[PDB]
Amino acid sequence: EESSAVQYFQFYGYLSQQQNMMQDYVRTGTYQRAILQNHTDFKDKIVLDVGCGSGILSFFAAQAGARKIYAVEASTMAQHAEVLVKSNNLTDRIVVIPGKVEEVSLPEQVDIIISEPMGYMLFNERMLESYLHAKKYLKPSGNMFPTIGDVHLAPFTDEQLYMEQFTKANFWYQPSFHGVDLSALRGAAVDEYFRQPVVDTFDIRILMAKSVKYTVNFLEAKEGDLHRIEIPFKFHMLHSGLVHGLAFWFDVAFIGSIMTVWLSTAPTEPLTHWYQVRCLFQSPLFAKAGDTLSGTCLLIANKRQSYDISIVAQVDQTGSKSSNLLDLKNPFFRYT
Amino acid sequence: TEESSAVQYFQFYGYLSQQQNMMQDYVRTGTYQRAILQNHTDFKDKIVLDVGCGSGILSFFAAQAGARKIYAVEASTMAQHAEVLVKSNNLTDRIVVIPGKVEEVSLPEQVDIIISEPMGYMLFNERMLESYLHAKKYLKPSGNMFPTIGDVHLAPFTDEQLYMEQFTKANFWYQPSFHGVDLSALRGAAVDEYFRQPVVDTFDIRILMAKSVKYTVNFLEAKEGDLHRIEIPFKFHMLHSGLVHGLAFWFDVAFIGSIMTVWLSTAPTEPLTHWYQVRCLFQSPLFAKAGDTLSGTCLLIANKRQSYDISIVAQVDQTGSKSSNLLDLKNPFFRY
Amino acid sequence: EESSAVQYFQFYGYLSQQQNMMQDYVRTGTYQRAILQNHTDFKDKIVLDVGCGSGILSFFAAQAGARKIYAVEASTMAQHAEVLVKSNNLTDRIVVIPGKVEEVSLPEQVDIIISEPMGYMLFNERMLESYLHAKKYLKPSGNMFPTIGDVHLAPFTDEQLYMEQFTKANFWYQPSFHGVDLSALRGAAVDEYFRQPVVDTFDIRILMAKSVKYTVNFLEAKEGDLHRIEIPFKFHMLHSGLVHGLAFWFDVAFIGSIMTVWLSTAPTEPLTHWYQVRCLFQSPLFAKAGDTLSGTCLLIANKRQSYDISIVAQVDQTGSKSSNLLDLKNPFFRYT
Amino acid sequence: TEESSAVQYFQFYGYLSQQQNMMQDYVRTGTYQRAILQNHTDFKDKIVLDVGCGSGILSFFAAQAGARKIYAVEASTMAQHAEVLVKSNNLTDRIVVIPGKVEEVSLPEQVDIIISEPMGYMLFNERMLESYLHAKKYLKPSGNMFPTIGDVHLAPFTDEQLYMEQFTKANFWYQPSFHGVDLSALRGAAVDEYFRQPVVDTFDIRILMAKSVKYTVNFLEAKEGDLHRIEIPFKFHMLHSGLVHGLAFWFDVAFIGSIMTVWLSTAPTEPLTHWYQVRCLFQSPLFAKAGDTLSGTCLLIANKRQSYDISIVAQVDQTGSKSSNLLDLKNPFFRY
Numbered sequence A, C: 001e002e003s004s005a006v007q008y009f010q011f012y013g014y015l016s017q018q019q020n021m022m023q024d025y026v027r028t029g030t031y032q033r034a035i036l037q038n039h040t041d042f043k044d045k046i047v048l049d050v051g052c053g054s055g056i057l058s059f060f061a062a063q064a065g066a067r068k069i070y071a072v073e074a075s076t077m078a079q080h081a082e083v084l085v086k087s088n089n090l091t092d093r094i095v096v097i098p099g100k101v102e103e104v105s106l107p108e109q110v111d112i113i114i115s116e117p118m119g120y121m122l123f124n125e126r127m128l129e130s131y132l133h134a135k136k137y138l139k140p141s142g143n144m145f146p147t148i149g150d151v152h153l154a155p156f157t158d159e160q161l162y163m164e165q166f167t168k169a170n171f172w173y174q175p176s177f178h179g180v181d182l183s184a185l186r187g188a189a190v191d192e193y194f195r196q197p198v199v200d201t202f203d204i205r206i207l208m209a210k211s212v213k214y215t216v217n218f219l220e221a222k223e224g225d226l227h228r229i230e231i232p233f234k235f236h237m238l239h240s241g242l243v244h245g246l247a248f249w250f251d252v253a254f255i256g257s258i259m260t261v262w263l264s265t266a267p268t269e270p271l272t273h274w275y276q277v278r279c280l281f282q283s284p285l286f287a288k289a290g291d292t293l294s295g296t297c298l299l300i301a302n303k304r305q306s307y308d309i310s311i312v313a314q315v316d317q318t319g320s321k322s323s324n325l326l327d328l329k330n331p332f333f334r335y336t
Numbered sequence B, D: 001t002e003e004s005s006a007v008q009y010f011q012f013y014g015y016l017s018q019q020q021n022m023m024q025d026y027v028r029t030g031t032y033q034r035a036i037l038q039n040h041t042d043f044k045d046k047i048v049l050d051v052g053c054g055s056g057i058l059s060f061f062a063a064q065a066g067a068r069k070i071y072a073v074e075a076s077t078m079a080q081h082a083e084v085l086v087k088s089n090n091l092t093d094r095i096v097v098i099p100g101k102v103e104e105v106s107l108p109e110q111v112d113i114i115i116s117e118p119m120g121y122m123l124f125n126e127r128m129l130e131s132y133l134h135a136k137k138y139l140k141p142s143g144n145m146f147p148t149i150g151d152v153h154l155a156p157f158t159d160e161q162l163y164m165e166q167f168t169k170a171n172f173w174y175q176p177s178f179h180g181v182d183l184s185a186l187r188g189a190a191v192d193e194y195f196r197q198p199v200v201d202t203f204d205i206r207i208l209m210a211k212s213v214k215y216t217v218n219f220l221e222a223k224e225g226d227l228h229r230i231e232i233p234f235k236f237h238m239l240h241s242g243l244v245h246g247l248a249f250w251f252d253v254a255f256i257g258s259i260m261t262v263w264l265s266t267a268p269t270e271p272l273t274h275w276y277q278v279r280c281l282f283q284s285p286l287f288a289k290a291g292d293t294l295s296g297t298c299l300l301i302a303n304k305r306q307s308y309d310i311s312i313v314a315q316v317d318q319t320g321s322k323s324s325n326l327l328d329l330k331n332p333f334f335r336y
């Protein structure tokens, strides 16, 4: 786990990463709107910013009137955050604390915790756990921004995406590649390709049923709740065809005193750098319009700051079933 | 850290997709097969050590050439796949896969020839050359090495579009009011981070402003420790007037066999490989006239990330115009 | 056979085909040079033009001074030939005879027979048989233009051409193509692709040994000699590598009283619309430089105006062998 | 002749490569699967006749939709391959391959629905529609046909580059001294032959000078003999001024099921298929002004080459400017 955590924080030490995330207008703009339009939740309040990065969310909190903001960052980016606090003349209101939120010391309980802990499928990088851990500094009336997170799952049809895996793996199905028979590895290649969640976007037309929503309430959830996430699903198919897998996206809600602001990564919304995630079935399942596709998606926290994904699905009316295992730490970025 | 970087490195090389991507480079694979097969008498009834064999392709080339025994050492999980291919190609009596690092494994026998594919970006990335040289502890006194030598070519280049691209990227951190936040205090750092990135892609040779300077490493003679600090002096005679935006790097390797010397070239005058070429930019370009001399030093210092900290000091001798640059070979910009 | 012959003559009824053949400057120019520079073989002579098409060769014979030329054509193109004889005011010297040379009546034995009977690999379309049949109208001192034909065979190496067959056939190696398992046909697809001679050109560097020449003397050969053509070969390899198959080209010689003129389709010569032909081995054969590749190419005339090609090859020093069957009536035109 | 053309046709369709090329058209295959699966109740426990099944893909779609029994009739040798796929897909109890022509085979049972892919270039090439209509002798009174209807779209176009290409090709036969030979007497014929060729490729819709005229064939109602002579009147209202170089043709087919009507379109406003579009050129273009009417008739007469002799008579009614053209749908120019 340590070898993955050090690489994770080294990755987040680069200003290019901060710039790429900040330039996502959905992300930065929705956070600023949620904080500013709920200024009553921040005016004169104590704020904790978990994983502040360059500190942008802490600056938004200061713009809303917070009396004191503790911005905690474990990567070297914390240094740069300090530079921004001095240059914006906010040292008396924003305190940058280098280190992990689980280890640093806060001198004071906070009125509200703000963070951007979302990864792919909302759970990748496991930072939500740190977010929930930060609740040890939250007052009994405390609030969380974001307040809740909805993960949406939906069956999809994409014959060409399914085809790509075998077209790629069939490189190995050659009896004389420079005189070498590679065919014995074909199966392994196939498996390796199917274990990769596919990060890109798609047309909403490929969705075959209304999505199923799994909700995490960050005010109520505990850290260990995220180690094992079981999402049952029962889709009522709106179209007839082959189902090649499940599509995942997420939304988060900032539930403030004045209003609730949503940040959505749905394929019906403008594209973000979270894109959408698709997990293929090893074998597709034929469903008639009106059938029910029932099963379970089990996300198990792994030692690489990600999740093993186990998906089991069946068409109830026919008994056809498919079972698939994926590793979210090695996704295939297909967007071009 | 060194342990974590090694863990990530070998996990990266455990994937069959990486083997496919490297093997589908026909220049690499075809040149290796040509060098081995056309020097078959260097392998006929010989003892072969394959350093970092991956899927084993070079071991199969050596077997085709008539090698009596080939020890194929691989530290990643790909070793298992190699064994599969050894069994399915009915070469269990000649190819012996040995899992683990070549620095730690035990071979039962001294080898007549060492074969490997140790070249990274700029030929020095991943520091695998060190392991390659380490393998000489198993080499017989009359032994040979494939590749035998490695030439690094440096040449000044002009590319205003590339400089403008990287500078425009860095210009994000010059904004005084990004969502009302002053980022300008970090701009310097931003610029540094962007110009520490080597640019990996190809280019037209018309951007080169002088004939290349060649630095040779003789793998037969070189010792492992030699690669901890590599100093490459250079004195280019400028053939065109204009702005030098940095130095371009490519490399050749020569398999100096008994029958024949076979070259593998990644030069921009040659068909493209997955090595491409690597350009190091200067934060401030140097104006030079044709007939001037551009002199300086490229210093590679081995770091614990299986890479090199690169220092490039260049100057137009006629005007004393000097440029000092740092480059982190662990954060390349893949421009495609 | 009839269903193929009617389609053959329908194909040759189009003026676009005549234009494409005439615009091949090697073809038309070499025929004109051979006839004109051997004018003593045509001056005041009787000439038979077998398969005259538009009549161009007969016009060349008239330009050389022939007293009477009988131009025989079986397709509808004969009509157009007549139009050209009237418009060029050569009706008193050129007589167009519609129909097949085996069935039409000639009123007179001829001094010389001219024709362009060459197909792919010199033997495709089997028109050489008709050419030899025309000798029933030849005087005992008669001559043939072309006089002789050399077919050259040589072993070649082309790893990518071999790879293409399996890349194409692996379309069928899919377990769910729109829900259908196609894999059971993969083998058949492979076989179908390997049975296609590949018509294109290539770099002479891919040739691995000096060519072996098989000669037909049209003055001495009989029609039935072309039904079964056995070409033994013993190549002495000039390079070490894998042999993926045999490359075929041809030359013809016009041996006239004044001089001999060659028309060559060799890959060392300018490209013609005959290109070159390559027959792959199902499995490549490794040969060291200095080894001998011995075997037989057997061309058997088939019922579709083409040949079944049986190729048997072995590396003598190792005993490795390959056996391959091809149908020249369904070649793959790879030139792009 | 008819027998020889049929022999060549079915030999052409015996090749697995043709099956791959047609099946790799995702618009064709995907639209057929969508039409069948989304109208699954038209197939659930029904009797299906697949006319010209080739590799059997549509029969497999019908089986996926729940068809109880599917008779898959194929006259080429591909029938054998279909049987292989039936056995390897474990559908021997539902899909019965019947080799031979649908006009000659005996089915044991009347069918609930006929499915086929009978469309050629201009929808009418290969005359397979006739066979399709013939299959209605096995159709139950309440039966259905997939496709149900076919729309042919005609539209005048301007393309000076295409006209110049074909005219330049024909200009070869205007030479007075091609190697000293006068070809000009054939130029007329040459021009005719080149402009009898339909041009199969795609184009931008900006070349169309009027809204398309639609001619519909109802496969449910149409009789086989109806396709021996097809008269398509047209009266275009010209939307742009300029030169009409000919008429462009494309086609749609509608699967009118119980649940849903699914369209397969080869229109230039739609993603490209292997049908492309087909343009018939005029030897002399017709000048027309916007607001004029271009009226005439396209007459398809079925010939013994499994194709149609096409006559196109068009005129600008305002000026009496007339153009009569013949086209041989057995000699298309594939412009890619």
Ligand SMILES: Nc1ncnc2c1ncn2[C@@H]1O[C@H](CSCCNCc2cccc(Br)c2)[C@@H](O)[C@H]1O
Residues within 6 Å of the ligand: A009, A012, A020, A021, A024, A027, A050, A051, A052, A053, A072, A073, A074, A075, A077, A099, A100, A101, A102, A116, A117, A118, A119, A120, A127, A130, A272, A273, A274
């Ligand atoms: N225990 C900790 N203590 C203190 N800080 C911590 C701790 N864990 C993490 N962090 C810091 O939080 C930050 C990561 S969260 C960004 C999550 N969005 C990713 C993302 C993915 C796809 C699209 C987009 Br758009 C954004 C880093 O700065 C990191 O160093």
Ligand SMILES: Nc1ncnc2c1ncn2[C@@H]1O[C@H](CSCCNCc2cccc(Br)c2)[C@@H](O)[C@H]1O
Residues within 6 Å of the ligand: B010, B013, B022, B025, B028, B051, B052, B053, B054, B073, B074, B075, B076, B078, B100, B101, B102, B103, B117, B118, B119, B120, B121, B126, B128, B131, B273, B274, B275
């Ligand atoms: N100490 C060790 N002992 C045993 N094996 C080792 C050890 N270190 C590494 N390896 C193995 O050697 C292999 C790496 S070298 C390939 C270097 N080309 C990269 C490359 C870059 C750009 C383009 C292209 Br095209 C190729 C891997 O299989 C790796 O696991």
Ligand SMILES: Nc1ncnc2c1ncn2[C@@H]1O[C@H](CSCCNCc2cccc(Br)c2)[C@@H](O)[C@H]1O
Residues within 6 Å of the ligand: C009, C012, C020, C021, C024, C027, C050, C051, C052, C053, C072, C073, C074, C075, C077, C099, C100, C101, C102, C116, C117, C118, C119, C120, C127, C130, C272, C273, C274
């Ligand atoms: N028994 C017969 N009696 C009378 N005429 C006959 C008879 N058989 C054939 N022909 C006529 O000869 C002509 C065919 S030979 C052209 C052979 N070059 C092909 C070729 C292939 C690749 C490149 C190039 Br460049 C040229 C046709 O006009 C044909 O109708």
Ligand SMILES: Nc1ncnc2c1ncn2[C@@H]1O[C@H](CSCCNCc2cccc(Br)c2)[C@@H](O)[C@H]1O
Residues within 6 Å of the ligand: D010, D013, D022, D025, D028, D051, D052, D053, D054, D073, D074, D075, D076, D078, D100, D101, D102, D103, D117, D118, D119, D120, D121, D126, D128, D131, D273, D274, D275
């Ligand atoms: N009387 C018969 N009885 C039984 N089967 C028959 C009969 N006639 C024919 N067939 C079979 O039907 C099939 C031909 S129709 C495919 C028409 N699309 C062509 C096409 C053109 C451009 C683009 C694309 Br994309 C596809 C072949 O399998 C053929 O052997």
